[PDB]
Amino acid sequence: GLTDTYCRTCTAIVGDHRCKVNLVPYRVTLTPQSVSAWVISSGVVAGYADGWFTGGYVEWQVDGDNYDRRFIEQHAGADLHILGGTEGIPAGGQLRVYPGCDGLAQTCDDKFSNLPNFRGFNAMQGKSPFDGDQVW
Amino acid sequence: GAKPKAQTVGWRYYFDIHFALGKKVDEVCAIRASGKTAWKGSITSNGQ
Amino acid sequence: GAKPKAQTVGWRYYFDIHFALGKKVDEVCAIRASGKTAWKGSITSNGQ
Amino acid sequence: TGVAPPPPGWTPPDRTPRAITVRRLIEAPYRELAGVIDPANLQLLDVSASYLAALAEAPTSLSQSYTLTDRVGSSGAFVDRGTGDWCPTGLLAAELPLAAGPNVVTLTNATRLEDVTVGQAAVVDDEIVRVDAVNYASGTVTLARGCADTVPAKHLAGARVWFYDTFEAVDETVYSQGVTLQARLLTNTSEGQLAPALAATDSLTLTGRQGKPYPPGQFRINGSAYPTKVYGALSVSWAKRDRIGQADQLIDTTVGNIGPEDGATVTLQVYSGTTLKRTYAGLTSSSWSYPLAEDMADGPLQDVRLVLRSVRDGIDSWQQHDITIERHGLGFRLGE
Numbered sequence: 001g002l003t004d005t006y007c008r009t010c011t012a013i014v015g016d017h018r019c020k021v022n023l024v025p026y027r028v029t030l031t032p033q034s035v036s037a038w039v040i041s042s043g044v045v046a047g048y049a050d051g052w053f054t055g056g057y058v059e060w061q062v063d064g065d066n067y068d069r070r071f072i073e074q075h076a077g078a079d080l081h082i083l084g085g086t087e088g089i090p091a092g093g094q095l096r097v098y099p100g101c102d103g104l105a106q107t108c109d110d111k112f113s114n115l116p117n118f119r120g121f122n123a124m125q126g127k128s129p130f131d132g133d134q135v136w
Numbered sequence: 137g138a139k140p141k142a143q144t145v146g147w148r149y150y151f152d153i154h155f156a157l158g159k160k161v162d163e164v165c166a167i168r169a170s171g172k173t174a175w176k177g178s179i180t181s182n183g184q
Numbered sequence: 185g186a187k188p189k190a191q192t193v194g195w196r197y198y199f200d201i202h203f204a205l206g207k208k209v210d211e212v213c214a215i216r217a218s219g220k221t222a223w224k225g226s227i228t229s230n231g232q
Numbered sequence: 233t234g235v236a237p238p239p240p241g242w243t244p245p246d247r248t249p250r251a252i253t254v255r256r257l258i259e260a261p262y263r264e265l266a267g268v269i270d271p272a273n274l275q276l277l278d279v280s281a282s283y284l285a286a287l288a289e290a291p292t293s294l295s296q297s298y299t300l301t302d303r304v305g306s307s308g309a310f311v312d313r314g315t316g317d318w319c320p321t322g323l324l325a326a327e328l329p330l331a332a333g334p335n336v337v338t339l340t341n342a343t344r345l346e347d348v349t350v351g352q353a354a355v356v357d358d359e360i361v362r363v364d365a366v367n368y369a370s371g372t373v374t375l376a377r378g379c380a381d382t383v384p385a386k387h388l389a390g391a392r393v394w395f396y397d398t399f400e401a402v403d404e405t406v407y408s409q410g411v412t413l414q415a416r417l418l419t420n421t422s423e424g425q426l427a428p429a430l431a432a433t434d435s436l437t438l439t440g441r442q443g444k445p446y447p448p449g450q451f452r453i454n455g456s457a458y459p460t461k462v463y464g465a466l467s468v469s470w471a472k473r474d475r476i477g478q479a480d481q482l483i484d485t486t487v488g489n490i491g492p493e494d495g496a497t498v499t500l501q502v503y504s505g506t507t508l509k510r511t512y513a514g515l516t517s518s519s520w521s522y523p524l525a526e527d528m529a530d531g532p533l534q535d536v537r538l539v540l541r542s543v544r545d546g547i548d549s550w551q552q553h554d555i556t557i558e559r560h561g562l563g564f565r566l567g568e
């Protein structure tokens with residue numbers, strides 16, 4: 001139950017109750033062009049910069065009001081890499097894809113402008129104690 | 137010759153440190169250093 | 185009377201210490217003490 | 233992978249001593265020697281004795297003090313003379329007019345303003361002044377003009393003010409007048425000392441500042457200080473200052489006579505704007521009037537230059553008064 005570390009990165013999953021970032025505007029609905037064993041390719045995402053979707057997840061409706069979610073290893077051009085393979089993904093079903101946050105403060109503010117809620121500690125201190133040996 | 141106009145017997149060191157006490161806290165009561173009570177009181181809102 | 189010819193403000197201490205860093209080592213890069221880089225470089229053979 | 237590691241490490245302090253950018257050299261007046269040298273040794277000091285002092289500003293907050301290095305002439309090896317603390321200083325936001333008595337001036341880019349204390353001796357350009365009041369927040373201080381062995385002078389905006397009192401580096405060695413020195417200031421930090429190769433150099437010419445007698449004090453003309461308007465009869469009043477009696481006390485021009493000095497007199501030069509016409513020496517009174525005999529010979533002098541100084545045994549004061557005044561009255565300026 002620690003769930004706390006004094007590191008540079010955000011230490012928060014994009015969209016959690018701590019980031020307070022609304023992903024609904026960033027939702028993208030698309031029909032995949034081609035599905036392979038490990039790669040799902042679509043031309044619509046080809047218009048975004050490389051790594052835009054890295055760290056995001058893909059959710060689609062299985063039955064009723066329940067959706068199955070899959071994380072994305074990497075995004076490059078028109079090809080998306082799916083962790084654990086693409087098995088179970090419908091070839092023509094409607095898919096919802098959300099972006100992913102790298103966690104860097106520059107990434108957090110330039111893309112999402114959520115710097116005030118940034119949970120990371122970029123440049124407060126790395127080691128400096130007040131009971132060391134020589135300050136200089 | 138004679139006693140200097142002034143003598144540098146020691147230096148005063150100033151440092152500006154930023155630190156965190158953990159997760160959200162309600163009230164800070166006192167600060168103790170080297171067994172001497174430096175400050176005692178109570179603050180419940182962001183301030184100086 | 186007057187300012188002494190010289191004043192002993194401090195002493196300089198010299199020590200000769202022999203120590204081992206463990207088993208065989210390939211290269212020693214730098215030495216850091218009290219947060220200050222005393223020496224940086226690289227040596228791969230027995231020498232001064 | 234997607235995540236990237238950001239820089240944060242330890243952010244080591246950047247001590248890396250720098251050379252001093254703001255500094256100055258001065259000659260110690262009799263005021264400090266009186267209060268720092270015992271009478272037995274002081275009385276044996278000849279009139280030609282001179283002492284050297286230096287002032288500097290901290291380039292970074294990580295520097296505690298600096299080392300003083302100097303040598304005689306342009307050749308030889310520097311000999312360490314000691315270390316000194318940083319001298320508080322500031323910049324004048326507005327010009328300081330020529331006027332005796334307290335004057336309110338605002339300072340910009342002030343450093344170590346908190347440590348300043350009232351009654352200290354402050355030197356700007358070539359004038360020594362005394363602080364009367366201080367405002368920490370706004371950096372506004374009141375300065376007494378024309379104190380010790382100095383006289384008021386025009387100081388344009390941007391002049392540097394030094395509060396050298398108790399903040400000066402002094403070389404105890406005694407140097408005779410006329411010798412030129414080369415000295416450098418080396419910064420000191422916990423990481424070590426600045427390498428001399430990077431230290432700025434400067435030169436100063438000694439002038440026996442302590443030896444020369446103080447100039448006259450209260451300089452009032454016809455009851456007015458530095459007037460451009462006088463109605464006819466010319467009356468000039470001056471004060472007699474004795475350096476030995478004053479000792480370490482700062483006395484401005486507004487104070488009355490403090491007695492003369494043994495063998496010290498007053499000399500006045502009368503000019504016609506560019507040319508020297510009359511010269512009165514050996515003056516011992518506190519006032520002088522232009523004799524009627526020379527009024528017709530020189531005729532009307534609408535533009536009159538008044539030069540005042542003190543001389544003893546042919547030793548003229550380092551500074552002097554000089555102003556060109558305009559006369560009005562009957563026979564003077566009836567073109568209007």
Ligand SMILES: [Fe+3]
Binds near residue numbers: 010012019101108114
């Ligand atoms: Fe974030």
